Design an enzyme around this catalytic site. Sequence first.
Site, PDB file in Angstrom:
ATOM      1  N   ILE A 206       0.787  -1.229   0.000  1.00 18.64           N
ATOM      2  CA  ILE A 206       0.000   0.000   0.000  1.00 18.64           C
ATOM      3  C   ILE A 206       0.819   1.279   0.000  1.00 18.64           C
ATOM      4  O   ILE A 206       0.278   2.356   0.149  1.00 18.64           O
ATOM      5  CB  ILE A 206      -1.032   0.056   1.199  1.00 18.64           C
ATOM      6  CG1 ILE A 206      -0.326   0.079   2.557  1.00 18.64           C
ATOM      7  CG2 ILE A 206      -2.003  -1.120   1.117  1.00 18.64           C
ATOM      8  CD1 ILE A 206      -1.287   0.226   3.728  1.00 18.64           C
TER       9      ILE A 206
ATOM     10  N   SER B 202      10.543   6.243   1.552  1.00 23.02           N
ATOM     11  CA  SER B 202      11.995   6.341   1.372  1.00 23.02           C
ATOM     12  C   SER B 202      12.662   5.074   1.902  1.00 23.02           C
ATOM     13  O   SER B 202      13.374   4.357   1.194  1.00 23.02           O
ATOM     14  CB  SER B 202      12.541   7.537   2.166  1.00 23.02           C
ATOM     15  OG  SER B 202      12.668   8.694   1.354  1.00 23.02           O
TER      16      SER B 202
ATOM     17  N   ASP C 189       7.567  17.738  12.422  1.00 23.14           N
ATOM     18  CA  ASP C 189       7.347  17.582  10.960  1.00 23.14           C
ATOM     19  C   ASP C 189       5.825  17.551  10.632  1.00 23.14           C
ATOM     20  O   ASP C 189       5.297  16.652   9.899  1.00 23.14           O
ATOM     21  CB  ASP C 189       8.082  16.320  10.424  1.00 23.14           C
ATOM     22  CG  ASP C 189       8.324  16.366   8.885  1.00 23.14           C
ATOM     23  OD1 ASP C 189       8.275  17.455   8.294  1.00 23.14           O
ATOM     24  OD2 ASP C 189       8.559  15.306   8.282  1.00 23.14           O
TER      25      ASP C 189
ATOM     26  N   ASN D 152       1.909  14.098   6.470  1.00 24.09           N
ATOM     27  CA  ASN D 152       2.090  13.354   7.713  1.00 24.09           C
ATOM     28  C   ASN D 152       0.815  13.240   8.569  1.00 24.09           C
ATOM     29  O   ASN D 152       0.872  12.826   9.733  1.00 24.09           O
ATOM     30  CB  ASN D 152       3.274  13.993   8.488  1.00 24.09           C
ATOM     31  CG  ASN D 152       4.628  13.662   7.852  1.00 24.09           C
ATOM     32  OD1 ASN D 152       4.783  12.636   7.168  1.00 24.09           O
ATOM     33  ND2 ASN D 152       5.607  14.484   8.076  1.00 24.09           N
TER      34      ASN D 152
ATOM     35  N   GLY E 290      11.459   1.968   3.074  1.00 28.07           N
ATOM     36  CA  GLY E 290      11.183   0.623   2.592  1.00 28.07           C
ATOM     37  C   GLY E 290       9.855   0.507   1.868  1.00 28.07           C
ATOM     38  O   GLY E 290       9.610   1.256   0.923  1.00 28.07           O
ATOM     39  N   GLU E 291       9.010  -0.440   2.273  1.00 23.01           N
ATOM     40  CA  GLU E 291       7.688  -0.614   1.650  1.00 23.01           C
ATOM     41  C   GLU E 291       6.623  -0.767   2.725  1.00 23.01           C
ATOM     42  O   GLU E 291       6.911  -1.236   3.827  1.00 23.01           O
ATOM     43  CB  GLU E 291       7.663  -1.840   0.747  1.00 23.01           C
ATOM     44  CG  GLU E 291       8.318  -1.646  -0.620  1.00 23.01           C
ATOM     45  CD  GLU E 291       8.408  -2.954  -1.408  1.00 23.01           C
ATOM     46  OE1 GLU E 291       8.476  -4.025  -0.750  1.00 23.01           O
ATOM     47  OE2 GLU E 291       8.424  -2.922  -2.665  1.00 23.01           O
TER      48      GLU E 291
ATOM     49  N   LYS F 114       5.209   3.020  -0.743  1.00 20.17           N
ATOM     50  CA  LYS F 114       6.652   2.830  -0.880  1.00 20.17           C
ATOM     51  C   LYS F 114       7.283   4.141  -0.553  1.00 20.17           C
ATOM     52  O   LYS F 114       7.438   4.977  -1.442  1.00 20.17           O
ATOM     53  CB  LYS F 114       7.071   2.457  -2.313  1.00 20.17           C
ATOM     54  CG  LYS F 114       6.727   1.036  -2.770  1.00 20.17           C
ATOM     55  CD  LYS F 114       7.486   0.651  -4.050  1.00 20.17           C
ATOM     56  CE  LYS F 114       7.366   1.740  -5.121  1.00 20.17           C
ATOM     57  NZ  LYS F 114       8.054   1.435  -6.410  1.00 20.17           N
TER      58      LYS F 114
ATOM     59  N   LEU G  32      -4.174   2.693   8.599  1.00 17.71           N
ATOM     60  CA  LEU G  32      -5.012   3.844   8.389  1.00 17.71           C
ATOM     61  C   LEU G  32      -5.291   3.865   6.914  1.00 17.71           C
ATOM     62  O   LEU G  32      -4.474   4.331   6.141  1.00 17.71           O
ATOM     63  CB  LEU G  32      -4.245   5.090   8.873  1.00 17.71           C
ATOM     64  CG  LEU G  32      -4.192   5.122  10.429  1.00 17.71           C
ATOM     65  CD1 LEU G  32      -3.224   6.117  10.924  1.00 17.71           C
ATOM     66  CD2 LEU G  32      -5.578   5.446  10.963  1.00 17.71           C
TER      67      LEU G  32
END
Length: 290
Positions: A22, A26, A136, A141, A28-29, A24, A94
Amino acid sequence: GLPGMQNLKADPEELFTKLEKIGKGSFGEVFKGIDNRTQKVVAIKIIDLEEAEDEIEDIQQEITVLSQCDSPYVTKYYGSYLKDTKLWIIMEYLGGGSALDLLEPGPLDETQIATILREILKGLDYLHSEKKIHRDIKAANVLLSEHGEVKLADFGVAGQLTDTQIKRNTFVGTPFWMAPEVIKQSAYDSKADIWSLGITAIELARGEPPHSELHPMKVLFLIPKNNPPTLEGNYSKPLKEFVEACLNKEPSFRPTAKELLKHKFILRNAKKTSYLTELIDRYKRWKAEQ
């Protein structure tokens, strides 16, 4: 070490079933999966510990902070598992997408903007009460559940204003959303998050933060030098005043998240979160055509 980290004995490939990739980022996945033991849906972030280095500090930091938070406004963390060189981080799933994703289809109305800000403000108030700083805050986010619940994600660089360190000085965050004192590395705190929230409010109304077309390095001298950004365009007076309240060059003059919760823009416009499902459905239909 990393809290919630499980021994290699616990094979994540046998305790969790990945349903579909669902995301990708920076690092990983990200997958949607099921904890087979409790048949509860979770988000599974997999990072290769061999294929990365300086990104490990951030990962570890993000998990340390998330394990110290207990709030329905902050994404839950369920533990980590190790499989050869892959770190599997298990979190609350989420499925509604990020607020930035929800902007992809078209603009939000002030009701939607107010609703989202109100929930972010609940998350900031919790974090601030726990003496934590997100560091951040931006629409990318802010994650939504499929029923419209809004939560804070991606601390990664989240800070801790504890006992012997009532203020931070680290140049951290994403330039366009960074408060002037953070860029100048003055002693800062929870108020930096309030400036970031103000920049995120312009972002939810216009789709991008101020100066977004400029090169980041230029933005680095503009923020401390220039008067604070204002929301321009056809928006209500209360929305523009909400943005001004957050965007004060002097940090001690910005209100707390608790007080913004009572700003007239929030009171007159925010509605129930379930109302955000429409916005969520618009994004899926749009995504189907991309």
